[PDB]
Amino acid sequence: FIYRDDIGAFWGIKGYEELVTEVGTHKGHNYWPQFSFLGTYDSGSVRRGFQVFARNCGNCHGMIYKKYDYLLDKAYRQLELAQMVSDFTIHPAHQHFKQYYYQEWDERDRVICDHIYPPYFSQDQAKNANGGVWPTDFSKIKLRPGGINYIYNISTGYHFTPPFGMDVPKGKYFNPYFDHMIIGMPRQLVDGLVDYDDGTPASTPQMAYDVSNFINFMQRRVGYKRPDKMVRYYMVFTGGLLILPFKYFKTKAYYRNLLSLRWEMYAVRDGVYYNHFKYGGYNSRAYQFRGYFWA
Template identity: 50%
Template sequence: EANNQEFLQKNTINRYLTGIRSSFLTGGAFYTVMNGAQPAEAWIFRDDIGAPHGIKGYEEQVNSVGMHHGHNHFPADITWNTFNSATLRRGFKVFSRACQGCHGAMHQKYDLVIDKAFNQRELMNKMVYLPKVHPAHQKYRGDYFQEWDYRQRVINDRIWPPYMTVHQAKNANQGVWPPDLSKVSTMSPGLSSYPYNLLTGYHYNAPFGLDVPEGRYFNPYYDHMIIAMPPQLHDGMIEYDDGTPSSAPQMAHDVAEYISYLAKSKVPDTKVVLSMILFVTFTFYPISYLFTKYHYVNTYSHRFEVYAVKNGGYKKFREKAFKTHKVPGNWMGAYS
């Protein structure tokens, strides 16, 4: 037993793996203690918002606006975690009722949430609540028949906006075009928190000197703070199937998670795959290095020594040592 213990302590690979394990445990403990649970952040990249205390000259009302607004918990933003299925179910309902009237997310399809939030039959049943789609939406439709009329959406449709053209969208929305929501949670300041902050940011009054035109609204989270979209979420406007109280912040949080899922559904899986690759690399690369070094140290540690001997010298030595061809005869010194 004592010999075995001594062997383990002297074994290079075992010592390396023990060190790695200790480092991981220490690092994990340090991360948990220092910043394990930070609130979700949202930033406003605007020159006229004085960092970090809100709009210049208006600090008393909008204080640190957007920095820690709402204290959201988006689990997919935390390492190793994935999207919450119940949240996605609720978010899909909010998206269908509150967003799909004007917005689309045409880079994704409805069936993206199958097996994550709904099964196939459940999702098919929910299609009746969505606005009808016109064949002109589908630029390259692969049907062998010609569709002539509006039809109900199906789960393998793209999440088309209800408008067929930009002009139609602008005509219906006071001259502005409701943007596509496919990538809004990856390309906006605040990432996943951006839809939440925007949808719950209507309660501020516009600062002195900023005139809000009729039919527009002040929202400090929007790009230039004057937004054409009216407040969309009101407490109790829909009824969640799972009984969750549908307050406006709750609905905003759920639909923000759904919009994030549209943009980043593969990210948790990618994180896992990358971490597996890194784990294998950082484990086996040093081990392979040690084995290689263990082998090559025997190659590099030879030293040829030349002696001044009576019958020979270096010429005869190198003829023997660096011999390139078999020479006939005189095996085992038979004739010498």
């Protein structure tokens, strides 16, 4: 019932005890406009996040489940998004299921309807290219310790050094936010790496923040639809609060009114005998008692 707070398991959820998972949610409060009360995605933030994802980190990762056209109202316009995404190529080998629709036999410029594939054809190609470790697919990445913060923390937590007794193999890097604090990703965010279109200063915390906002935006439950659904929840709750009194009037006051009955019992001493009571009564389940009980 009471779960110790220093075991490394948050609220009793065992596992993830070789990770730093409470940062930003339980210990510390990183502010994300999406999850604030009556909050929403910052359009500029998601725009810059897609810019940084395309110019970097799209060369190893991808969102096979997602497609670019999700960014058509809050992050980009159709023409702008088409122009931006036409800088990349997809071979038919990328397609997960051609189904006779994709008739191309050579590389072609991506369209906004295309799924976000990595530059590699398959997972094994990416795993081979990255030292035998596969850059995880960012679709459905919401399910990580810390949620939206997970992208932000890992991209930034390359500062600490390993303790005694922990060995980082060559080609591996220490990052306390990853499982077992060893990650195969070299640090990617560096100040000035990406030149934003709006002129926002490009410091690694800013790039990490924008990437996290975009990755979260591409999710389905905690993504671009959560704020509106939360507002809908608020409206429905207000409606229920407003309807409670009318429910009370309909049900409880009405029942109390129906029970305002006056009863009277008199003394009937006429010759009539109470033979109906002695010989009477019907039981709907009598067929279950006949020949079985009290014989």
